[PDB]
């Protein structure tokens, strides 16, 4: 395949207002270890390298938060994967049944994302 150093890569990043980890594209290395992230929700914010996870397609059995487009929030566990229209999806099992959600909707609660930071963290 092909890649570029940070800028352009889809990654998961912490929303710096002490929030969870959400999907985004690194728009630019800001400097000093900050990289700006065009979140897939269209927000654009600097995030420090330690707060970005760049090789993070969610592993199955990981616990995650899930957001419906009609803005309902829950948490559950990844139990599968899909690809549709060039976008990456996860079947989040909740209440013993699978529900499909998309990368930007499968948000890693901060204590979940921490377990990935030690491996996938840029910093």
């Amino acid at each position: 395949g092909h890649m570029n150093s940070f800028v352009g890569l889809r990654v998961v990043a912490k929303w710096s207002s002490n929030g969870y980890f959400y999907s985004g594209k690194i728009t630019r290395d800001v400097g000093a270890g900050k990289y700006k992230l065009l979140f897939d929700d269209g927000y654009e914010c600097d995030v420090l390298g330690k707060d970005i996870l760049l090789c993070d397609p969610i592993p199955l059995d990981t616990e995650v938060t899930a957001l419906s487009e009609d803005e309902y929030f829950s948490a559950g566990v990844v139990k599968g994967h899909r690809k549709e229209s060039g976008e990456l999806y996860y079947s989040i099992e909740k209440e013993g049944q699978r529900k499909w959600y998309k990368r930007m909707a499968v948000i890693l609660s901060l204590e979940q994302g921490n377990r990935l930071r030690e491996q996938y963290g840029l910093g």
Binding site: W15, S17, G19, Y20, Y22, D41, G42, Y43, L67, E69, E71, Y72, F73, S74, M104, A105, I107
Partner: peptide
């Protein structure tokens, strides 16, 4: 019951 609890999503961004 429950509803979006943190900042996520937006509209007209395309």
């Amino acid at each position: 019951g429950a509803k979006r609890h943190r900042k996520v999503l937006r509209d007209n961004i395309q």
